[PDB]
Amino acid sequence: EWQENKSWNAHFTEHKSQGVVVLWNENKQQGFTNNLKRANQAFLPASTFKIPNSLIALDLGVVKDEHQVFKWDGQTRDIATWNRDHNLITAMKYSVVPVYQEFARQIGEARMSKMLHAFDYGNEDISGNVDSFWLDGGIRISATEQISFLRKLYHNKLHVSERSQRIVKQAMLTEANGDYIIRAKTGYSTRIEPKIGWWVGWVELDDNVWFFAMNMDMPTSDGLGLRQAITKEVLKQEKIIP
Numbered sequence: 001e002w003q004e005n006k007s008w009n010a011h012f013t014e015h016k017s018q019g020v021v022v023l024w025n026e027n028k029q030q031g032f033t034n035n036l037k038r039a040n041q042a043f044l045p046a047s048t049f050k051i052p053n054s055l056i057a058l059d060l061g062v063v064k065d066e067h068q069v070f071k072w073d074g075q076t077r078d079i080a081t082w083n084r085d086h087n088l089i090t091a092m093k094y095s096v097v098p099v100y101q102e103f104a105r106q107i108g109e110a111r112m113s114k115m116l117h118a119f120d121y122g123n124e125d126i127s128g129n130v131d132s133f134w135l136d137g138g139i140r141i142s143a144t145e146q147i148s149f150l151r152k153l154y155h156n157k158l159h160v161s162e163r164s165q166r167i168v169k170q171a172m173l174t175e176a177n178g179d180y181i182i183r184a185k186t187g188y189s190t191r192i193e194p195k196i197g198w199w200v201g202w203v204e205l206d207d208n209v210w211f212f213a214m215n216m217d218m219p220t221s222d223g224l225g226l227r228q229a230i231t232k233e234v235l236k237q238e239k240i241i242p
C-alpha cells in the first residue's frame with residue numbers, strides 16, 4: 001500500500017530544496033513517496049482550493065458554464081494577468097483570486113461547510129473570512145489527503161452532478177501530447193508561515209493513471225518553476241513519462 005523511496009531526495013538536494021512528492025498507481029493500488037512524514041502533514045491549500053470551490057459554484061448555478069464572463073473590476077493589482085476579463089478556464093490557469101472570492105461570497109458559509117463535509121476534504125474547517133479562509137484561515141490538508149479527493153473526482157464519485165465534475169476536469173487541463181495528458185492545479189501560499197508551493201493532479205496514460213501531489217519550501221518567488229521540474233524528474237525516473 002505505501003513504500004518510501006529516498007533515492008528521490010537527490011532531486012530536491014541538487015536544487016537546494018526541501019519538499020515531498022507522493023504518487024499513486026491506480027491499476028495496482030500502490031503508493032510511493034520520498035518522505036512518509038511530510039507526505040502526511042497538513043498545510044493551507046491556497047489556490048489548490050480552486051478545484052472544490054469551482055465544483056461547488058457550478059453545482060449551485062453561481063457559475064452557469066465555462067464561457068460565462070467575469071469582467072475586470074478596474075482595480076489594478078500587482079499580478080498583470082489578473083487585470084483583464086476571465087472565464088472559468090483562464091481564471092484557473094492564471095489563479096485569479098478576486099474572481100473566486102466573489103464566488104465564495106455568493107455561496108456563503110453554511111453551504112461551503114456542507115459541501116466540504118460531503119467531500120471529506122481535509123480538516124473540513126472554514127474558520128476565518130468567508131472569502132479568504134483558504135489563504136489565511138483555519139482550513140488544512142495533506143498531500144495524501146489531496147490524492148484521495150482527486151481519485152473521487154476522477155471517477156465522478158463526489159456528491160455533485162456528473163456535469164459539474166466533467167467541467168472542472170476540463171478546466172484543469174495543463175499539458176497533452178502523444179505520450180501523456182496532465183490535469184493539475186498550482187498553488188502558492190505566502191500569507192501564513194511557512195511559505196510553500198503546491199502542484200496536485202494526475203497523469204493519464206493509454207492504460208493507467210498515476211495521481212500526484214507535491215509541496216515544497218518556497219521562501220522566494222524565484223523557485224516556482226521547480227514545482228513542475230522536480231515532479232517531472234520523479235516521473236521520468238519511474239519510467240512513467242519519457
Ligand SMILES: O=C(O)c1c(Cn2cccn2)ccc2c1OB(O)CO2
Nearest residue numbers: 046047093094095097186187188189
Ligand atoms: O502558483 C499559483 O498558482 C499562484 C501564483 C503563481 N502561478 C500562477 C500560475 C502558475 N504559477 C501566484 C499567485 C497565486 C497563486 O496561487 B494562489 O495560491 C494565489 O496566488
